[PDB]
Each structure stands twice: as C-alpha cells, then as structure tokens.
Symmetry: D3
Amino acid sequence: GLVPRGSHMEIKNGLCTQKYTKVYAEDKEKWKFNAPHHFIVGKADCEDEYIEPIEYVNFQEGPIKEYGINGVNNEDLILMVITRLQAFQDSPYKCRENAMAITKLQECLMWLGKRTLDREVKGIE
Amino acid sequence: SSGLVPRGSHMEIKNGLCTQKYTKVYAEDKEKWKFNAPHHFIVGKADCEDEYIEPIEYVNFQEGPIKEYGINGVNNEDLILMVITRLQAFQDSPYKCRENAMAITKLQECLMWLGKRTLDREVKGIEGTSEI
Amino acid sequence: SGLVPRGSHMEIKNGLCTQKYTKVYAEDKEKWKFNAPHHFIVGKADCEDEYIEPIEYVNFQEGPIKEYGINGVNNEDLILMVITRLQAFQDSPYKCRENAMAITKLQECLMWLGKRTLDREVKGIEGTSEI
Amino acid sequence: SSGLVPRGSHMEIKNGLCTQKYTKVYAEDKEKWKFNAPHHFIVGKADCEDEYIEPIEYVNFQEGPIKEYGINGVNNEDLILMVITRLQAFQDSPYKCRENAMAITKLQECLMWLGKRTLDREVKGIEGT
Amino acid sequence: GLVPRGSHMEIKNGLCTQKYTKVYAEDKEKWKFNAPHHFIVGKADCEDEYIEPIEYVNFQEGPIKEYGINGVNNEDLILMVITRLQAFQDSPYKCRENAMAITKLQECLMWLGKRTLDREVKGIEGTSE
Amino acid sequence: GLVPRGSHMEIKNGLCTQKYTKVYAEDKEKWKFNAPHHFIVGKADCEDEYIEPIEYVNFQEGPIKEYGINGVNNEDLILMVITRLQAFQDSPYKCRENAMAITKLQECLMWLGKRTLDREVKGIEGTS
Ligand SMILES: [Zn+2]
C-alpha cells in the first residue's frame, strides 16, 4: 500500500517536527494560479522514493463558475482545527497553549475575511 | 444522486467567522466523539438540502494516541502547514498583500504555541500518550 | 461663558492616556443607563475642577437599536475615525512604525467586536437586549 | 428642521471592517484636509439618500497648533479612552464576553504604541515640533 | 574556576535551546521579596556537582528607599536584548524573526510600564504596597 | 566607586522609566560582529563624566566554535525575566500586566527559536 513519490515535493518547515507524519504537494511545475492545490499527508518512516498516504487534501483549483467546486478552502481546514481544539479545552487536556492557538486561528480567519470584505466594497470579490 | 449521502448523525459546523458561501463543514455528532473531540470531518457543497450532504472532501484526524493505537489520520499541524504553504505562495505572486501576511503570522504563532505544548510534553516524556 | 458646572459628571482617568490639554468626563455611574456611560465630554484641562470647559460632546447609542431606535454613535464609528486619521498620517511625511502598529491593533479590535456581532446575527439576537 | 443637511463635498468613509448597517461615517472633502489628515467627522444615519446626511453626531479633532489656534478639538486618545471605558462597563454586566476582553486588550496596546512615539520624541527632545 | 551547585537551581524552560549555556538562581527557599534575585549563567559541561560561571546577574532586592540600589531591573536586560536585535537588523542578517522579537519585547516593556503608570496614578512607589 | 564613561554610550529608550538606573554600552566604533557585546548597568546619580556601576553584562562575541563560551545569550536573560515574572505571579503582586508580559516574552523566545530551526532545515548554523 504505497505509491511512488516522483516529483511530488516534500513540504519541510522549521516548525515541522516531522516526527510522525510528512506533508507533500504537487511538483512546483504543476502549481496553477501561483499556489499548490493537491496535498498528501503520509507516514514519515517511508523512504524518499515512496509516500505512505494517510490522507489526500485537494484545494479549490480554478474559478468556480468554470471548473465547478473541486476542493476545500483554507477557512475550512482552519475551522476544523479550531473545532477540535475547542473540544480539547472541554476535556482534562485543557491548557493555556491550546487557548493561545485558538485565539491565533480566530485572528487568522479575521484577517482572511478582512481581505474578502474589502474587495466587496469595491465589488471585486 | 450518486454524489449524495445522508446527513444523519452529522453535525454542521456553524462559525460566524466563516462565510459558508460555497461549502459547509460537517463532523460526526458529539455522542460519537472519541478521545473528547471530533475526528471525522466532511466538507461539502452548501446548496444542498439539509437531509443530505454532498461530499467534496473527507478529512480524518488521528484518532487515539499514537503510541497506543498507532497512526490512522492527520494532525492539526499538517493542515495548518498546508494553509501556510498556500498563503506564502500567494505572497510570492502578483497578489501579495498585507492581510495574507497577517494570516501567515497568526498561523505561525499558532504552530509555535502548539509546539510549546509538544516541547513541554516531550520533556515530561508523556508525548503521544493519553496522559495529562 | 464657556464653562459648565461639573456637577455629577465624572472624570475618566487612565494612565495610558496623556491628559495634558484635554480631559474626558462622563455622566455618573449612578445615572448610567443600560449598564454603561453614554454622554461624554472632552473639555479643556486647565479649567476649574468645579467647572468644565466643554470642547466636544459625544453621545452614544442608549439601548439596543431594534428596541429604542437610533439615538447616538457606536464604538465602531469612533474607532473608524481614528483608523482613518492614522492612515492619513501614514500617507504623509510622518509615516512611522508606531502608527502602523496602532492601525493594526485598532483593526483587530474592530474584528473582535465584529465577531461578536456576527455571532449574534447567527443567533438572530443582534441589536436586541438578549444575551 | 428636517434634521437633515446636504452631503455636498463631504466624503463617505467606506471600510470593509464596518457594516454600515445602522450608521454612516463622513468626513470633510479631501481637498480641505489640513496637515495631512481629516479633522471634521460626522456620524449620520445610513438609510438616508446619498444626497444628504442625517447627522447624529459631530466629532472634531485638533486642527492646528494649540499655540496658534487654541484647543479646538479632540485627540484620538480621547475617543479610544471613551470606547475602553464603555467596554469595561459592559464587562461588569450580564453582557460580559471574551470578544470584549480582546477588544480592550487591543485598544490598550494601541494607546501604548501611540504613547511610545511621544516618549521617543521626548527622549530625543524633538517633541511637538 | 568552578563553584559547586549546592544551593543553586537550574532554570530549565522548554522554550530555551539549552545548547551551550545553563542558567541558575538561588534555591527556592532563599527567595526574598517572593523572587529570585541572584542568577548565574554557566557552562554546560555537566559536572552535575558544580557550576562553571560565565556571568553573574543580580537583581534589585527591596525597596530602593529601604535598601538602595543593589541590583538590576528586568527592564534593563530587556533593553540590552532590544538594542542587540536592532543592531542585528542593521546588518546583513536582517530577518523577519528578529523584527517579531523586537515587537514582542517592546510590548513587554509597554505592559510593565502600565503597571507603573497606573501605580503612579495613585503615587505608590518602590514599595511593598 | 566610579569609572570613567569615556567611549561608552548610554542607551536610552522611552519605554524605560529608568529613573534610578542607566544602561551603558561600548562605543559603536568598537562594536564587533555587527552588535554590542559589553554592557553596564549603572546608577543615574552621577554626571556624564562617570559611570557608577551596579552590574556588568557580557554577551557571547565571536562564533562559539572559534572563541569558546565567553558570554551570555539573549535567550538566557529573557529566561531569567520570565522566571522572576512567574515568581511574582505566585505572590500577592499578581497582575494582568505581568501575565501579558510573560506571554510576550514567551512569544519572543518562540520567534528566535523559529530562526534556528529554519536554519537547521536549510542546514546552516552560525555561518558568515
Ligand atoms: Zn498579538
């Protein structure tokens, strides 16, 4: 149950621990409209040759009236993480770090939403 | 028809900060939550009738502590990494803007706080376990 | 004359605010209605404490709008003014980093207040007196 | 007496972060901006036609050096202080909530940054020049 | 040379890289004014029994009025760090992380000051009050 | 107990109350590796001519693998301030302001640590 890596590009961050999982995106050659759109979360034990897919995440690619609805938005994933962290706060695992994180995520959503509202005033959205 | 599954015990995720214009986010109902949180999420098209959900994407989080149960789903940090990567690509484009910069900053701080939790919980040797 | 009696007006003192030339007064807590002060006066500082030299009057919306109508400004309007002026300052020879940080903080203040408002829109209780 | 006055050269402050559901904010014409900023704001009612403004309140800021023109207006700090006092009153009430707490923190930090600049000018001795 | 650890405790925090230096203070029982006031930074060669000093950092204990200047403030060290990071930003190693740190440290200073300014609204100074 | 100020420069910030102490450092012309490394905290009693020193603070100057361990790192000082501020919070002096300051200092640590980790992913440490 593996699949070849190929030119799938591994997303390494300084803030990755990459202890359990690794994140990949499509080859930078295939980025449409300035950004990657097709991510894979796989298991880290894997050799660089292959990826052990745990999950596939595909973002909205292309204009909506033209290619339909074919993926998720950033806001959706952030909302998922916020929901889970709020659940964790309602448990014995409540802690100040999760609270800080939730605040940071809500402020993130605020700033992206500010981008859309500003365009709306000009009608561009 | 072939793209519809019933809402059933799935709950819509309401948030006032999310536009909900083209998509809706669902999760499993609270009764079914294990390890205190939802783990099985669906993003689906908004203009659907309530009785059904039209799935676009399935996202399944790690259910259970890994040391005990192994690896069976994504982590919060993985999704946040995807979002940071996309926002930084946007910044490296003609559509660089200040709002995207702010969002990147907030997301990186979010990762740093979650990471402080993980660091502290490494030092205690209780990382990936179910202990408080 | 230009002076009015202080009377039951109360001085708003805050360490973070300089207070060299202006003073902020509000109606007394006793006469506060709707859980907050609503009738503020900026006056000149070097005036008799017994009196107030009014520079400006600012009256806020008293009571939810859907129940009492419209009778004053909201917090959001004042903050919008301050943001507009600081941005004008940024688009001038006096552009600086402190003004940029202040604009950011005020915009985040608006976004937090706005999240409250949107959550009450979802709950259908916006502009009411419900919790 | 219709409680209603012509817009004219007044300009409308449209911002993405403001809904304009109940009130609209106007300022004086950009051509009449003195010393790089607007100084004469109006809060009016939104349902009015663009032709006119239904004034609720007028807010004026210090325009010009005090030595020469006097104290003619308010400071940004004054309005921020009013808003903080009001939100802290709300927190001491059944309407206590976390968003208000955030707002207070943000507004206090805003005051801190504005105060920073002055303190800096003071240390360098170039204040109010 | 070397001094033994004895009644000195290592300040471990997960946010600190710990890679070449260690930080020590008086052991908890000796704290005065509810706080550690005598810190030593030292080498990480692990003679668990002993500490290899690099710097002694001593904080003001007590009311200045009662005891006089006898140590350093938190403000002073934070000033040193801000000054170095601003120097770094005026260098080939300018970076966004350093800019963030300078902002966080300036806001730290701003909050501590509020505490004092608010105390000065009541006039209480350098006191147990 | 005095020392001449001489080349030393006073570091003055508005955000400093600084009513009782002043902080001095070496001359900019003697700054090495782009930044100051030698600092003194002194009483403000004195005139410009002299410094009365309460404390000496010397930071690690030169790469650690050439010159050994000859000074402190910013992380150490920030650590100490955090540790004392948490101490005050377990005391009658607990205030919101302090908590907020501890939050800011911890976020400072997170950002500086983000630099090292990034450099580490890129494989570089303490390079020129
Ligand atoms: Zn912040």
